[model samples]
Target: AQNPNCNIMIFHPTKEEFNDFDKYIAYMESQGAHRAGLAKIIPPKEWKARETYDNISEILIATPLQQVASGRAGVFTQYHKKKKAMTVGEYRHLANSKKYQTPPHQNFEDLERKYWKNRIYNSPIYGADISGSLFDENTKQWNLGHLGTIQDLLEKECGVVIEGVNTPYLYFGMWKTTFAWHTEDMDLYSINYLHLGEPKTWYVVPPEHGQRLERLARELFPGSSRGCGAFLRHKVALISPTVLKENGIPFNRITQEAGEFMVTFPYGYHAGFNHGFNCAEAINFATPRWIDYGKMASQCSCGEARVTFSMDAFVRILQPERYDLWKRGQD
Candidate 1:
């Protein structure tokens, strides 16, 4: 059954409060994308979809991909069996080693316009903050950057930090570039900002029914696991929302248009594909409340969590440090 409370939330910051950090965070913590109200701020010009695409193509021509994966879409396996990984430069040589080698299934010009410009979507080092440094002189030691906002104060008080807390992976996508369904690291919150493009559509299953949905998916696929390979555990092996809805699990759909932001809450299972070519940025964050879920967050669906927050550090280091500093006389 569709949970009556399940839905996407949006916020449109007024000119007066466009920069009001507290209101923004409070909205994200309470409603997330599934709850319905977070402001939608227009992205800057250089970040627009077409402009960004031009920027990417220019970069590729000037430099070349250091590393990337090549594979046929709609057929990627868990381990990317069909994918041939190589340096971006290597792939570039092959593309222009000759010419007119476009496959029958693909249109050379269209492909170039849609996906080729920024074919490499994953950038592991795209920093989350504007300044992009966890160790900037202004930051307290062990303090992550300005993501989530709360971490800033924590680092200020504790005088320590972890840069990983503000990791913001970047993406350059075209039609069908996808991220499979799974919760964010530690099942914390995720905020995805779409700089520009056609838009990306998202599917979300609320936490109250996450495990049940996972089990039902298995039943629907029956023995699909054995043949599914590594993708079996991730709900990426063609599970459909129509099937879920038919079986009485209502999932919410949020289409993130250009210059928009989408937030997913803790344990909200989600996945989506680009409507067309686009570029976007995303980061994960946790508030003080995450202390209770630290252990759970450390355990990931992929077997091991790649990132984890330090509850001990937050309690012993960040929390007390902030209060102590506040108590100090500035008078």
Candidate 2:
């Protein structure tokens, strides 16, 4: 995963689009967004096994992890116990095989998920191992210049825009994307596009089906809460790249980084899973709020069914008066 030789996609935004990136970054900095890691777009490498010595080194010395546990934190968990599953040789064999399936072993209940989730000072910020750069500012707003607001973007180039109402999409390379997802604080959109092999997202509904489904769900590890409308309940919506085009399965989710795709799931559970390989850039940013009004609004809903949508979710998308931190940073 640390290989710089991975096919890198150069991000060359238009003058206006570049300005949008600038605004987004400025907004993030105003709210205390620090560099967590690097996200470069390019072709996903064939899973090359890390060096054996280095692998062992990471297992023994590199990670600096303490005793492991159970459930999402235990040895039986699907996430690697602080290790890479395949070596370059092993990946070469799997890719060459006609099997063509995303590794099911790539599932939930892993230590890395929780570990990575805590990488930033702020809670609720997640980095996509998929594509693009994500901002790490807590966006707690829901109006213009706020999270998911049309002002969040520069003048629209492509993607879905609601007339003079709200522009919620941006185009990269050939594909269009909307990074709109719901969090407890507010809803914010983050996405970047590219031109490359598509990512086949394999997913299954949540665990409410029963204990048996829960067990199998652990095996597939498709991270999602099946639109349960709660952020914390989100799990792996990941699927092997092989599952998307399996034999004759319908592939309505086929998205071209050269075209437009929606990552909008405000107050919903979803993860952007990759199919084959892609060279795309995705920058993640949450709406930043300085007050608890946004938080307060989300805890209780109005004019909606129970567990339907966060009240804050409604305000962020439809109305916002007291909360708009994502935009507050700019001024």
Candidate 3:
């Protein structure tokens, strides 16, 4: 495989801390994965303002509320137009609306054939909590079980997490992978565990299919994996990192016990989202621990740049763009 860099790993969380969000945040912080933006590590709510925001501060996606409602960039666009700032709640509300597309699917190849190849479009990239709240109302109460334990649902049920690192994961909602196809020009390893729903990825692209990779990117998201301007543009679905582990077709098995994941490591091919699959088998995702800003320091760091932006700085930066737009909506 020309893409032998092998940057993927499924991680199993430590037992005691699996159900503890704060503990998970601490774990990622200890490994410096928080700062690198590999995985969003977070201190508990009690320590938020007091602890002083550092690399360990993570974003939480508790209930379907936050999961569904965090995509109102149009509101941000509105704010950017009206010269106003958005409260995290307001932003999430706007984001959840029909304002943005959620790119529904279970196959990346099909996306190429239908959209990228036929019409040409991509999907959206998720944003930060901005609310500074790191806990989701959805899975907060339970400490272990189907929705209680993060690790239990992952390794034990979904088959994510592998040997090597004890890195904790922070799973996000349907994050569109829209981008060009090329092996990450970095040295990293980790499987992007397949937790629930659908696992749509094109990691093991044959050399002959190289053009398909580049073609997907150039035709759609171009050089940026986040897709043109962060709107839903590419085609995607659920993925199973274990398929690569056992040496299978690379997109097999689904879990229902828990859904959603955020895996680290740079694998070849791009684009991933939910496939509308029921929650019977397990179909969500959990991204493993890995560095991003430094993922391709030699090539070019690309992802979650807002992690470093101060609240005020972020607002000021967006002032000329979407801030005003969202403000006008207030009236």
Q: lDDT at 316 for candidate 2?
A: 49
TM-score of each predicted structure versus truth: 0.57, 0.29, 0.30
Candidate 3 per-residue C-alpha lDDT over 74-135 given as tens digits, one digit per residue, 9 for 90 to 100: 11110111213433343334334564433445565553334323122323333322222222
Worst 10 residues of 1 by lDDT: 123-132
* Model 1 Cα lDDT, one tens digit per residue, 143-246: 22345543554565445564434455556454544555677644556767675555676777777667766676566545544443223334344334555666
Assess each prediction's global lDDT (C-alpha) against the native. Answer: 0.46, 0.27, 0.30
Scored by Cα lDDT, where does model 3 land?
A: 0.30
Candidate 2 wrong stretches, greater than 4 Å? 1-18, 21-96, 101-187, 192-195, 200-234, 237-254, 258-268, 286-331
Candidate with best TM-score: 1
Whichever of 1 and 3 has more lDDT, that candidate is 1
lDDT (Cα, 0-100) at 46 in candidate 3: 32
**Model 3 ranges off by over 4 Å:** 1-84, 99-260, 266-270, 273-297, 300-331
Residue-wise C-alpha lDDT for candidate 2, range 1-331, written one tens digit per residue: 2222221122233334333533644443343221211122222232111212222111111221111222321111121134334332343233334443223324332322332232121111111232112121332211112234432331232232232233222111101111221232233333334323343231221111213333333443433223222323222222222342342222122223332222221222222333322333333333333122223333222211132222233344444553364223212
- Residue-pair clashes per candidate: 22, 47, 69
The model with the greater TM-score, 1 or 3, is 1
Alpha-carbon lDDT of model 1: 0.46
